């Protein structure tokens, strides 16, 4: 033999890069550290005066955007605050705690549905809203170092993976159908201009019922700015596609080519031709122009953003026009011309037509820019110039072409009056010239088509800011026309505004009462008709999900709000006879140490040492015959508890009975003998107890009842059938885990009580025990099938309550997610458990896990190129091996560029059920038959990991697992920090287990053959 | 009355609770527009106003982290294996494992490993430019989230350890003074008391040397981060910090001795007897340009070598002896360059009352040589840049200046830069302040360094890696070598030449050194602690060992664990030959007990593993090598057999023989028959346990422990059985019972085979610890005295020390290990001598272990304590956050006057006042707060109270009362602030879901109390 606890020489060099621990100091020179620091950088050089190539470049470049990992990750911190200061900020008020719950339990349909009813724009919004100037800037979080919420990134990534799910927007399911609709409903309404504001308007008319909207559009295309000037590489024109696909599913009609114009639509024309109301959501058409560039052409080198941005736009989003047109040549030096959003975006789109350099000057300071951070830091770090306090005078075109424009100084005085002085010039060599002053209304021809609404001071459209109504009660503006709006989502909110308004207008001109309170529709699709209601034990509930009998249940009008909520059923707070009333202590819930020091939002678990209920039988029973008086179809289940005593049980069985009780729960955490001939302390703990205690309570009530189980037990299937024979229709598995969390450093316990600052074991509860519910809800549904289970444990989403199901679970209890948050969360569950199962009946995405698409290769949420020297090449995302990824990218967008093919945008339709859509019923139990002994498990079929180095972030957590808990089997290269899994793999999945890039890490059958490590 | 339905008071008090909405909300444009004030959090990028900072010097950096901030952010840190971070710190700091001492709550460690390689931590976490350094090469930059705070969780910990008051001690590997080799008492001298002196001196004193000498010109100390680097970014408490930290080494100091002709120069230094120097008196001098010549301070002019001196000496109390006044700077300052310098003096201008602040620089903003995060601090504070301007002439009318003039630089065709004398730029300034770099251009000084080379910079020449002069016995670094551009640049100029300087002096004396450099570490009385324990006739050298599990696997990964300081370690279970297993995959997956969070700090794992797939031989040769090499490490021999006497016996003698100290007893293994619903397994059956004991402790004569299984009813009869067999103690506990979790259609993971099958696993982790935690503490009540060997969730010096406390002697680790690698160890090392030092120092009684008692903070920053600011209901938004900057600037002009700062505080290091505990007398002291129920007090009720200076307005604990609690808390729908109210029972919910560390907390209840009942 060798030596066998001594790596052999290959393994010795495997572990090269595997941390030891140091005796010393490092020496390393301050030269030679320089030179190394090249090798790893991730970020921006500060040394770096030099813009990489970006000519034909659309590639989003929003530093908000999301992918699965990462949106789960910063939906689990954010606060979900009450009356949320971000939704306050938000112009179309979105519900974000509620969108943003809905992340957090992986309920991306259930998020994108609270997006759109409030934003039919969600997912452009979600996009380009200068958060920072609206929601984001009132973020709680803001008050903390990591800062505040991405909101916007978050509202992206789940409206994403809801146009990835193909579902159709539907009509309004409370509205009657459409033949026995009002007469008033049938008006003919007219929205002019296809942008936000209109496609807002006409999608809350569609919801109000509205059967005959239409949107005139001046160009052959729709969408508005949106479309024709906002650039691909911030706003890819399939969203803008999507949103109006959304808006068209409700019958709202665009015709293309028919202005607001005279000698073209006019409010006359529409008047005649029997339209009931008009909505005027044409934007700011003309661009707001100088003097000093009259008779400029752009083949010398001039164009305002009018004139520049659709013409990126019309060669870089395809679908936008039949012309595959060509990328302006932009060659040179450029000048963009002011200081809001839409200068920026001419800048960042020059350098796309091959410019090579962008000055954006301005006429004022730094302190004075317009547009949010934002957008400003997309041009600071594309390497623009930025040029302040420098108006322009004079352009000096030599050769047909732009050479120069010459500036003066505009300064400030003590007064704030901003002056030009003409001594102080620039003459600033420029070979593009593009004004981006802003957007103004100027055309007569279509003022004139306005007649007769009043036009105030800015020559725009008077309306009352708060219905949108002009000065003709029957014509409507909104949005940049009205010069109220910056914004898409403001420009969005003043055709949601008028709607209501209009809505109320029209009625009112057919006799018609609209209610004093505006109420416009949510936003509905056909998953909003899943049947999720189930039977168990002859009770029939509405939704699967109910209150456990625990804090949340403290008192029977907390159940009554959360009954208000949507919950399907609750548990009383456990109940017993006067003689057995309880008195809590204090401090007696406290927050779990199960996942370290996180605070706030989502703990992994809570300790409590709380007893049964303080309150009387007498008000649980009396609770009881209220709520069921009132809601009669939200089951009501009483627990109780007693001593081991027949009559106790019997008496407290027979009066929660009487109080009309849908069912009972026995709480079998009461104590009974001294507790240890392998039964414990607990009646719960025994079965001869709890067979016997559920034959009294059979002989005593003829409702269902369950027996409530601890999972404090060695044989969990043996107490279950114990109820089983004692006559219970079910059992509830399982209640809290006996536990210490903890104790402070001075070996004081948490919680703890008086003076003599003691303690007791409490129970954990939470989703650190969901492994230990689970278990036991696997257990007996395979050891007493059919028998109807409760299942308790760690349940806080759709998703998870799913997995219950599917072990064999009929009903869902829960108290730890809804101390975690409140009641509403109910409002989560039940949108996420029809999507998970309309999703069962789409074959199209029979590749994805519930609501999450299969995971293509990323990093920063963004995809990988796809293409063949950039994949297989050895280059991971730093150093000089980004500087040859940046290069590669750069040549390949150039010969798509010299081959300006490929314009196949392909049409949307909708994905459609192609099995019925399975009910509560169709999954219960179908998951355990996966389930068996150890036996039953295939070795021939061994696995290996495999890596995505496309994916891969470097950090060799895989490389230190499976060397100092595995088999030494990943190489770390120690130039690249790529790894890559050997053949001495196992197949353990500890690798895997620790990624923290979802599916980097891959397990596949393993090719070569394998023989099992033994030593010998 | 109707018991199920909230009174109208207790409806008001919900008027804030959340509700599920039916209806999308109405909110014009405007008014939305006029509500966003009311809740902004942030910057308005419409206020052009820069707010009043005169003489105020608080923290403005972002980066400044408390402990719950700074706890997030060292969890989310990968902790990456060759971490590329580290790479790009110069002084080679180990971030990931000072990071990952953090995370563990160790702040000593973490600190101790800082200061070991930067002698100047807390200065560099401060200022370190961490965007050009380490921060620029972290891996999490490639996830949307981001890079790691690095330089925050450096002076998070570095600023905890300064609380300590923990001196630095001689390196205690050094013999005693006496006993030390004459060269080290050499008389070494070195010039400037610098970053780049104090490293140097800092680390030739921990290689021993005795006579160390720092000559400063200046009456202070620190070099320019004492005299420049502002107040607001670097407090002098810092720099007064880590030169006591070096003065503890006995390094001397004398103050207004100078390297010049007319006093020190090398040749006074040869002739006193110095035998080697080193050169840090950096660049003392400013770069100048002609057109300035004869300008003082009273015209208006300064360099940035005059003004930030006369700022720092009125800022930094006890940076000397004469108080100074803030420079009367009023009106327009101009700010010539774009350094690192440039942008202090900018921003120590609006301090000193500037009513505006123009940056100028000769190029454009491209070409800003300072760092993205100086910036930023002069753009948020309305400073205005003005780019292409080179200054050409200063206006001086009536003895002061009125502006300056300037022409407009530009880059033509090679890029280099012409000035355009044409383009004109009359800029009206009342200071100008040129700020273009630092110099040496004394000739006295120069003179004094004769004769060693000067380069075409005119700086020394070193060899960059000795950092040696042309003169042997000189050596040089720090800014006047030309290299350093940072703080942390100069202190590895310093520590590079320390080690050199040793090889020159030693071999001076005839001794010659280790080819390969070793500089000691740091080292202060907490690496004194003895931390060995005793138990069960066994001295482990620390309580920290590997668990039977995956990180035991082979026996090459004991030895590396060993190397690495691991206390003991059991191997991983093995059987007989006949009892062989074979392994599926996969069998290690990553626990869901707390959410989608991937990478760092998986809250548990799943395994379906077997034993070991090794041989009872492997292990026997095993165990007889590891205990030959490490006679100081126990071994423990994990073994399992079927229910069998001979088996037991022949493999536990198996195991004694190769040397083993001990045996672990693997009772996971199944019986025949299963009988009476009391477990398959033999662990779970007292009467086979204490059988399979008694065998064992038939075969062997060597301890033998009972690894006992958490899966029962009552652990403490398995435990006694274990007593009754044979054993020496148990070993609490084995993993939970567990299913982690099911893919959405069904399948569960791990899932093996093409049959997707799986079986029930063992749930191990922090998931686990109240479940170990428990089992420990009922073993230790019941069986006073029998060791207890800890397993469950142990992943730090603190949660170690919890199962310590409990009852357990030593404790086993396996997830954290999986989690990391195996140098956690010394992370658990360090932590366990703080937590026990600290609980001598009668100083730090208030901390939780290493946690300070929390203050009143916003983003971890002290709020301030004025009168005006509490007791009037201000939050830190809106209106309310303006109103508290108007009190806090008029309070910092009140302070300009009311003008003290002769009461510094003598930094005196804090003393043992009492024993530094051993494990021995921890180990139980836990128990006397634990007992049943009835001993806990329902007298001494608690209530919750707030304290709204740290609230973050999220109101959590509101909707945590409201629907889960006792609807006890106001939530104010303007100030979004709580206020607990008297119905409050103490439950303590609240403050468990508080996301802002001790903001709430529990206290004595002073109101009476009367339990809620309902009913009487
Ligand atoms: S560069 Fe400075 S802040 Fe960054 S890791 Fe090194 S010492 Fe710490
Ligand atoms: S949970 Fe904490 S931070 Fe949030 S409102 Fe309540 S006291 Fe304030």
Same mark, same amino acid.
Not at 127 to 154: H, R, W
Not at 350 to 371: E, P, S, T, W
């Given at each position: 033999?060798?030596?066998?606890?001594?790596?052999?020489?290959?393994?010795?060099?495997?572990?090269?890069?595997?941390?030891?621990?140091?005796?010393?100091?490092?020496?390393?020179?301050?030269?030679?550290?320089?030179?190394?620091?090249?090798?790893?950088?991730?970020?921006?050089?500060?040394?770096?005066?030099?813009?990489?190539?970006?000519?034909?470049?659309?590639?989003?470049?929003?530093?908000?955007?999301?992918?699965?990992?990462?949106?789960?990750?910063?939906?689990?911190?954010?606060?979900?605050?009450?009356?949320?200061?971000?939704?306050?900020?938000?112009?179309?008020?979105?519900?974000?705690?509620?969108?943003?719950?809905?992340?957090?339990?992986?309920?991306?349909?259930?998020?994108?549905?609270? !997006?759109?009813?409030?934003?039919?724009?969600?997912?452009?919004?979600?996009?380009?809203?200068?958060?920072?100037?609206?929601?984001?800037?009132?973020?709680?979080?803001?008050?903390?170092?990591?800062?505040?919420?991405?909101?916007?990134?978050?509202?992206?990534?789940?409206?994403?993976?809801?146009?990835?799910?193909?579902?159709?927007?539907?009509?309004?399911?409370?509205?009657?159908?459409?033949?026995?609709?009002?007469?008033?409903?049938?008006?003919? !309404?007219?929205?002019?201009?296809?942008?936000?504001?209109?496609?807002?308007?006409?999608?809350?008319?569609?919801?109000?019922?509205?059967?005959?909207?239409?949107?005139?559009?001046?160009?052959?295309?729709?969408?508005?700015?949106?479309?024709?000037?906002?650039?691909?590489?911030?706003?890819?024109?399939?969203?803008?596609?999507?949103?109006?696909?959304?808006?068209?599913?409700?019958?709202?009609?665009?015709?293309?080519?028919?202005?607001?114009?005279?000698?073209?639509?006019?409010?006359?024309?529409?008047?005649?031709?029997?339209?009931?109301?008009?909505?005027?959501?044409?934007?700011?058409?003309?661009?707001?122009?100088?003097?000093?560039?009259?008779?400029?052409?752009?083949?010398?080198?001039?164009?305002?953003?009018?004139?520049?941005?659709?013409?990126?736009?019309?060669?870089?989003?395809?679908?936008?026009?039949? =012309?595959?047109?060509?990328?302006?040549?932009?060659?040179?030096?450029?000048?963009?011309?002011?200081?809001?959003?839409?200068?920026?975006?001419?800048?960042?789109?020059?350098?796309?037509?091959?410019?090579?350099?962008?000055? +954006?000057?301005?006429?004022?300071?730094?302190?004075?820019?317009?547009?949010?951070?934002?957008?400003?830091?997309?041009?600071?770090?594309?390497?623009?110039?930025?040029?302040?306090?420098?108006?322009?005078?004079?352009?000096?075109?030599?050769?047909?072409?732009?050479?120069?424009?010459?500036?003066?100084?505009?300064?400030?005085?003590?007064?704030?009056?901003?002056?030009?002085?003409?001594?102080?010039?620039?003459?600033?060599?420029?070979?593009?010239?593009?004004?981006?002053?802003?957007?103004?209304?100027?055309?007569?021809?279509?003022?004139?088509?306005?007649?007769?609404?009043?036009?105030?001071?800015?020559?725009?459209?008077?309306?009352?800011?708060?219905?949108?109504?002009?000065?003709?009660?029957?014509?409507?503006?909104?949005?940049?026309?009205?010069?109220?709006?910056?914004?898409?989502?403001?420009?969005?909110?003043?055709?949601?505004?008028?709607? @209501?308004?209009?809505?109320?207008?029209?009625?009112?001109?057919?006799?018609?009462?609209?209610?004093?309170?505006?109420?416009?529709?949510?936003?509905?699709?056909?998953?909003?008709?899943?049947? !999720?209601?189930?039977?168990?034990?002859?009770?029939?509930?509405?939704?699967?999900?109910?209150?456990?009998?625990?804090?949340?249940?403290?008192?029977?009008?907390?159940?009554?709000?959360?009954?208000?909520?949507? @919950?399907?059923?609750?548990?009383?707070?456990?109940?017993? +006879?006067?003689?057995?009333?309880?008195?809590?202590?204090?401090?007696?819930?406290?927050?779990?140490?199960?996942?370290?020091?996180?605070?706030?939002?989502?703990?992994?678990?809570?300790?409590?040492?709380?007893?049964?209920?303080?309150?009387?039988?007498?008000? @649980?029973?009396?609770?009881?015959?209220?709520?069921?008086?009132?809601?009669?179809?939200?089951?009501?289940?009483?627990?109780?508890?007693?001593?081991?005593?027949?009559?106790?049980?019997?008496?407290?069985?027979?009066?929660?009975?009487?109080?009309?009780?849908?069912?009972?729960?026995?709480?079998?955490?009461?104590?009974?003998?001294?507790?240890?001939?392998?039964?414990?302390?607990?009646?719960?703990?025994?079965?001869?107890?709890?067979?016997?205690?559920?034959?009294?309570?059979?002989?005593?009530?003829?409702?269902?009842?369950?027996?409530?189980?601890?999972?404090?037990?060695?044989?969990?299937?043996?107490?279950?059938?114990?109820?089983?024979?004692?006559?219970?229709?079910?059992?509830?598995?399982?209640?809290?885990?006996?536990?210490?969390?903890?104790?402070?450093?001075?070996?004081?316990? @948490?919680?703890?009580?008086?003076?003599?600052?003691?303690?007791?074991?409490?129970?954990?509860?939470?989703?650190?025990?969901?492994?230990?519910?689970?278990?036991?809800?696997?257990?007996?549904?395979?050891?007493?099938?059919?028998?109807?289970?409760?299942?308790?444990?760690?349940?806080?989403?759709?998703?998870?309550?799913?997995?219950?199901?599917?072990?064999?679970?009929?009903?869902?209890?829960?108290?730890?997610?809804?101390?975690?948050?409140?009641?509403?969360?109910?409002?989560?569950?039940?949108?996420?458990?029809?999507?998970?199962?309309?999703?069962?009946?789409?074959?199209?995405?029979?590749?994805?896990?519930?609501?999450?698409?299969?995971?293509?290769?990323?990093?920063?949420?963004?995809?990988?190129?796809?293409?063949?020297?950039?994949?297989?090449?050895?280059?991971?995302?730093?150093?000089?091996?980004?500087?040859?990824?940046?290069?590669?990218?750069?040549?390949?967008?150039?010969?798509?560029?010299?081959?300006?093919?490929?314009?196949?945008?392909?049409?949307?339709?909708?994905?459609?059920?192609?099995?019925?859509?399975?009910?509560?019923?169709?999954?219960?139990?179908?998951? +355990?038959?996966?389930?068996?002994?150890?036996?039953?498990?295939?070795?021939?079929?061994?696995?290996?990991?495999?890596?995505?180095?496309?994916?891969?972030?470097?950090?060799?957590?895989?490389?230190?697992?499976?060397?100092?808990?595995?088999?030494?089997?990943?190489?770390?290269?120690?130039?690249?920090?790529?790894?890559?899994?050997?053949?001495?793999?196992?197949?353990?999945?500890?690798?895997?287990?620790? =990624?923290?890039?979802?599916?980097?890490?891959?397990?596949?059958?393993?090719?070569?053959?394998?023989?099992?490590?033994?030593?010998?």
């Amino acid at each position: 033999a060798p030596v066998l606890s001594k790596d052999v020489a290959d393994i010795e060099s495997i572990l090269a890069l595997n941390p030891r621990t140091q005796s010393h100091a490092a020496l390393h020179s301050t030269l030679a550290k320089k030179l190394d620091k090249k090798h790893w950088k991730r970020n921006p050089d500060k040394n770096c005066f030099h813009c990489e190539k970006l000519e034909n470049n659309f590639d989003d470049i929003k530093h908000t955007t999301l992918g699965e990992r990462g949106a789960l990750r910063e939906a689990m911190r954010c606060l979900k605050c009450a009356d949320a200061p971000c939704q306050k900020s938000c112009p179309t008020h979105l519900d974000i705690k509620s969108f943003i719950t809905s992340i957090s339990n992986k309920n991306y349909y259930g998020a994108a549905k609270m !997006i759109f009813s409030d934003n039919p724009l969600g997912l452009t919004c979600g996009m380009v809203c200068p958060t920072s100037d609206l929601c984001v800037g009132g973020c709680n979080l803001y008050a903390t170092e990591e800062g505040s919420i991405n909101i916007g990134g978050l509202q992206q990534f789940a409206s994403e993976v809801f146009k990835a799910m193909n579902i159709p927007q539907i009509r309004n399911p409370c509205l009657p159908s459409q033949e026995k609709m009002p007469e008033a409903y049938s008006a003919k !309404i007219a929205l002019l201009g296809a942008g936000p504001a209109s496609i807002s308007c006409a999608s809350f008319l569609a919801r109000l019922g509205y059967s005959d909207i239409t949107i005139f559009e001046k160009q052959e295309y729709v969408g508005g700015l949106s479309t024709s000037e906002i650039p691909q590489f911030r706003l890819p024109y399939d969203v803008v596609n999507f949103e109006i696909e959304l808006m068209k599913d409700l019958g709202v009609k665009i015709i293309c080519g028919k202005s607001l114009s005279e000698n073209e639509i006019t409010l006359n024309t529409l008047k005649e031709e029997g339209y009931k109301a008009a909505f005027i959501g044409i934007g700011l058409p003309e661009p707001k122009t100088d003097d000093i560039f009259q008779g400029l052409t752009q083949d010398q080198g001039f164009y305002t953003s009018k004139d520049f941005l659709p013409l990126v736009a019309k060669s870089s989003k395809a679908g936008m026009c039949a =012309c595959h047109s060509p990328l302006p040549s932009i060659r040179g030096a450029v000048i963009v011309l002011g200081a809001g959003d839409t200068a920026f975006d001419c800048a960042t789109s020059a350098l796309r037509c091959g410019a090579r350099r962008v000055f +954006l000057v301005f006429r004022k300071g730094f302190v004075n820019i317009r547009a949010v951070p934002e957008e400003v830091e997309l041009a600071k770090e594309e390497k623009c110039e930025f040029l302040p306090f420098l108006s322009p005078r004079k352009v000096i075109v030599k050769g047909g072409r732009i050479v120069a424009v010459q500036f003066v100084r505009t300064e400030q005085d003590e007064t704030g009056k901003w002056n030009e002085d003409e001594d102080q010039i620039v003459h600033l060599k420029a070979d593009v010239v593009i004004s981006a002053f802003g957007s103004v209304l100027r055309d007569p021809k279509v003022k004139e088509a306005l007649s007769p609404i009043k036009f105030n001071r800015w020559d725009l459209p008077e309306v009352d800011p708060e219905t949108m109504q002009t000065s003709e009660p029957w014509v409507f503006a909104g949005g940049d026309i009205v010069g109220m709006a910056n914004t898409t989502v403001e420009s969005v909110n003043d055709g949601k505004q008028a709607s @209501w308004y209009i809505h109320k207008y029209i009625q009112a001109q057919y006799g018609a009462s609209v209610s004093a309170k505006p109420e416009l529709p949510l936003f509905y699709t056909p998953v909003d008709l899943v049947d !999720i209601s189930v039977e168990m034990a002859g009770l029939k509930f509405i939704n699967p999900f109910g209150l456990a009998s625990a804090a949340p249940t403290t008192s029977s009008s907390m159940i009554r709000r959360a009954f208000e909520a949507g @919950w399907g059923f609750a548990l009383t707070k456990t109940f017993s +006879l006067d003689k057995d009333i309880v008195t809590n202590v204090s401090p007696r819930i406290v927050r779990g140490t199960t996942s370290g020091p996180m605070y706030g939002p989502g703990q992994s678990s809570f300790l409590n040492i709380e007893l049964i209920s303080e309150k009387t039988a007498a008000y @649980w029973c009396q609770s009881v015959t209220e709520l069921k008086a009132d809601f009669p179809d939200n089951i009501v289940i009483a627990s109780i508890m007693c001593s081991y005593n027949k009559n106790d049980w019997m008496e407290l069985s027979r009066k929660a009975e009487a109080s009309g009780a849908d069912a009972l729960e026995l709480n079998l955490s009461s104590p009974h003998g001294m507790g240890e001939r392998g039964m414990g302390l607990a009646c719960g703990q025994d079965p001869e107890l709890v067979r016997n205690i559920c034959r009294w309570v059979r002989q005593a009530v003829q409702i269902p009842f369950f027996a409530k189980l601890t999972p404090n037990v060695t044989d969990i299937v043996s107490i279950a059938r114990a109820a089983k024979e004692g006559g219970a229709d079910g059992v509830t598995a399982t209640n809290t885990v006996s536990g210490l969390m903890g104790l402070k450093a001075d070996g004081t316990p @948490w919680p703890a009580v008086g003076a003599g600052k003691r303690t007791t074991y409490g129970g954990v509860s939470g989703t650190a025990i969901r492994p230990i519910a689970l278990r036991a809800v696997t257990t007996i549904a395979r050891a007493l099938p059919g028998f109807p289970i409760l299942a308790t444990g760690g349940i806080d989403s759709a998703e998870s309550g799913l997995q219950f199901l599917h072990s064999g679970a009929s009903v869902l209890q829960v108290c730890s997610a809804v101390q975690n948050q409140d009641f509403t969360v109910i409002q989560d569950y039940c949108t996420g458990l029809k999507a998970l199962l309309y999703l069962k009946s789409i074959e199209e995405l029979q590749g994805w896990d519930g609501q999450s698409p299969g995971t293509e290769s990323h990093q920063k949420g963004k995809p990988v190129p796809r293409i063949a020297e950039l994949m297989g090449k050895k280059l991971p995302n730093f150093g000089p091996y980004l500087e040859q990824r940046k290069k590669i990218i750069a040549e390949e967008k150039m010969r798509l560029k010299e081959q300006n093919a490929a314009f196949p945008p392909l049409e949307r339709k909708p994905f459609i059920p192609k099995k019925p859509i399975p009910a509560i019923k169709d999954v219960i139990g179908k998951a +355990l038959q996966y389930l068996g002994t150890f036996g039953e498990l295939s070795n021939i079929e061994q696995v290996v990991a495999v890596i995505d180095e496309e994916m891969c972030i470097n950090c060799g957590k895989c490389y230190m697992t499976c060397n100092d808990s595995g088999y030494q089997a990943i190489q770390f290269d120690p130039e690249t920090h790529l790894p890559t899994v050997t053949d001495t793999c196992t197949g353990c999945t500890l690798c895997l287990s620790v =990624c923290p890039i979802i599916d980097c890490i891959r397990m596949v059958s393993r090719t070569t053959p394998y023989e099992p490590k033994r030593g010998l």
